[PDB]
């Protein structure tokens, strides 16, 4: 019942992103925490909740933030744990400043980056879900199902 | 001893980049398989690499590639381990091209994707040792000390 | 009756492009068969199409799809059928995810690519046609045809 | 031998990309002509090149050029042949302005458009010699050998 | 009465643009006509019009086009006149597409290019004004006051 | 005789650009006056250049600038002559920084606006020749002959 | 009572943006003056304002400003004032032709740029505030009392 | 005498950049520091610099980093003081990367955002200057005479 994943997300407005990571992690059945933390106007909640994640018993943390994206980056400067970072879409640049905020990060701290919008936050939930896999034969078998599943009920050809 | 991570990339060319990842995971004794697989010139190849995966016992998978780059998403698509992404430079693009194939996956198949270029290699494979670390305590010491070790190794000023 | 054009795409999503290079098809009495396949979510459905392909009398292939767009690539790799490819227009990004993750192929395994969205769809049906019709006299007339009406169908003068 | 392929140019400065179709070409002994022909510069040679290049036993144009690069999108304009494009890179946009001016055609008038660069004029010539297969049971055999080398040729693993 | 500016465009949809571009001349009461002609789709259009512009006594030509735009740039390969070109927004690439194959045009054939839109159309039919105006004494009297009253008339402060 | 064509631009580091509108200018015998001009660092100088202009017989401006490059719109706003701009090749943004702060100007404030680098420049002294050539028969005939040049002196193949 | 701050503008346009910035003024209790004022439209306007800016007791402009936007730029080459710059987001471009237009000038004229659109003139203001905090404890106590309220102000968890 | 400009930045490779802020507080006689601080490399550094910042006396940070760039929005999370921010251009991205992670920071923390690269250094210091400038009449007048001597000094026509 303790969180292993803990998804964090800038702002209420993120969430309408971060929520499908909610979704899919509870679907697999992983506990995790959601919260708000903000790199650029919460630095200090965030030092405390990336210093401490991993003695916690956290095992990965989800990033989901738009614009000058500093909250996954500076979430994996605090924590050894795997930082993964999601780019929620902004309405000028479309997630691109998102993107790039994220992704280009350099040598010595990674964050492992997802799809702009609510397929990166998804894939954030599955990527996470797949490095549990790895030392949970039970998650394991349930993450196989579902990507089994998802392969199975793509349509063989289109409706008009 | 066995490799727990692969690291693959579409060509020789890349190997000036994923190098990095190479001598990354050496450093922190991470027994791996370096390898060529390209997604369009040897798709047979890559669907045997990416679903025996696995079953040979590796953990994480570290993918390459520059231009198009189908590596990485496609051994995602065969593999329910989890597969980094690093986008290579190209010539025309820059590795923008690289980056947008790699990180812009559909929701269902994840790829972790890191910065375009040597520093991006190198963080995948720090990705991967963080991984690896939830389940092995003397790695996960030795990361700590990487990361100790980069933070104490910052200059304070800049030389001329 | 037997099609020789095959009309492949991503997802149901795709069908309101793929539609486009469906119907031309029609128009100029190009056998065809159109097809759901997925690079990333079906890639053992996509693999047994492209092997087989041209053994089932398929001369060309159009391949849609958007965001990280390997459909039309990875059909490349294990066909040696022409492949055309068509960028489907992605939300955030706009398609520019599409076109680069399908037109920057590597040297040795070619796309033809079109045009982002509907006008691409419709081209690449054409552009199956004009290769159709290098050893078809009846379907060139028709296609002359087609040209030659498109051309005289456009107006002098603007209307207010 | 009678050309079946034209290859053509906005300049001779297109001529380092260019020259990787014509060699392509020559390797599957493919009979072709390679010219310089602007859009631009020089428009009536252009229009009479396209509209006679089918009488003349053409059965695939492949064009090349920079900058705004009209010169592919052009000659589909006047002639019913498949043509094919490729953006060479230019100085200052790195062929982006070349491959959109290409790639982005209405609809009724085809370019099968390929990588921007040397791999794209490459890919040309391939794309035209799988076109030229379907008629060609020689040629079909020898694209087909071209094919397997190319898959067979990438090494395991990189060099040091 | 006889026209000394042509404005052409691609389409009967660039005239939501192009139409801004005819206001702005009948309202300096520059004599000109004004018509639907396509690079790509109507080539043999665009050469005799282009061809024969001069002799008929147009001084500037105005030519709008979206996407893989080529009117203007083959206008100007055919006359000496000096052409203006206005790019047209495209849907998916909001006339990034449209500008750079306008403005880039090689060296030795100019197009004189204005901004994406509406604007631009304005700003070529005042700049083909501008143009007439080095001749003509009461359009440049006319010219001067549109001009003055344009800058006379922006508000000194804002309203809520 | 005196200048009926100012070529202006932003700095000495321009003129690696700008000398190629210079040459075409002297080739065609179409005396000009060539100046360095900041909108920035040099306000006053251009408003006084631009504002006499006209007064001191200038019938066109070529202005050229890099980075964020407000001297051709500047200019335009001063003098009601035609004003053509250049975007110079900036080392970081290639000259989009460029061609942006160029051709985008407002509704009622026209820069004709040229290529990215040295074949804009070119175009640009160009444009004011077919701009001069309209009220200028031997002007219009050297320039006849210059672009006859052009087209006839392209080669017809690729030499190695 | 007397202006401190100038808030500038292109046009009542940029207002539904600029006004942002004037109200956190009014918020943090900073006299200050709004006005419209246009580089490219009404140069001799901005002439004024921005050489009298000083002696007219101004500390900071803030200029809002967007397309070929110059009018922070060209306030900043007539005054010695520390001028902040708000790209206005634009229609095509996204505000992406606003922002280079305004943040790449050349070395020896400073615009400090913010964000495109609403908060980047909330962070103007914020900035503007925040400079004039450096001599004015009492607003320096006002603005640290802003933040502070800020970073409580943050939710901790997500509402659905 | 004690610094009131801190210029930080992300790494040594920075230097060749931000010495340009360096030269130029010197020639003002601007009293600063010059350090090396990383946003994701030393962020307890970082927290500690700009949390003591104006304690010590500091009244403007610069800070100057390439790639996904964290380090000025950071140190603006964490000070009440203006701070400004360059962006280095990175390798692949020619600083696009930066600038967009430094320039669109939320409403509520404000980074002065100047050009990529060595101008943006330079004018990050002269921005500082004019800052410090309002309350310095003596570095009021040497900026005075600073952008006096700019501005005389630019030729009036370039050199070949
Ligand atoms: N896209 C792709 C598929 N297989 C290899 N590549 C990429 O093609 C680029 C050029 O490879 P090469 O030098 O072999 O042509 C490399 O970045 C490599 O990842
Ligand atoms: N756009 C165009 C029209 N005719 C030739 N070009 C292109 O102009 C670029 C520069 O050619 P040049 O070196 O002759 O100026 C080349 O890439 C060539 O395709
Ligand atoms: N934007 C601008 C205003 N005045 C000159 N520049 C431009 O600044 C760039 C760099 O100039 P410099 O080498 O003098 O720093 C040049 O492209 C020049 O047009
Ligand atoms: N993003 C970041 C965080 N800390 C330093 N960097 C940046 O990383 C780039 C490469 O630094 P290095 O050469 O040390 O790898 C530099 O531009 C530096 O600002």
Same mark, same amino acid.
């Given at each position: 019942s303790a969180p292993v994943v803990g998804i964090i997300m %800038? *702002? !209420? *407005?993120?969430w309408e992103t971060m929520r499908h990571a909610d979704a899919l992690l509870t679907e697999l059945e992983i506990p995790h925490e959601t919260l708000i933390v903000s790199a650029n106007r919460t630095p200090d909640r965030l030092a405390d909740y990336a210093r401490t994640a991993a003695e916690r018993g956290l095992n990965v943390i989800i990033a989901g933030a738009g614009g000058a994206a500093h909250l996954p980056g500076m979430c994996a400067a605090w924590t050894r744990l795997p930082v993964l970072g999601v780019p929620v879409e902004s309405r000028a640049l479309k997630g691109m400043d998102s993107l790039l905020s994220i992704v !280009?990060?350099? %040598?010595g701290v990674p964050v492992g980056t997802l799809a702009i919008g609510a397929s990166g936050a998804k894939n954030a939930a599955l990527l996470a879900a797949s490095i549990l896999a790895l030392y949970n034969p039970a998650l394991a078998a349930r993450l196989e199902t579902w990507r089994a599943l998802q392969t199975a009920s793509v349509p063989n050809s289109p409706i008009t």
């Open positions: %800038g *702002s !209420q *407005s993120d !280009q990060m350099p %040598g």
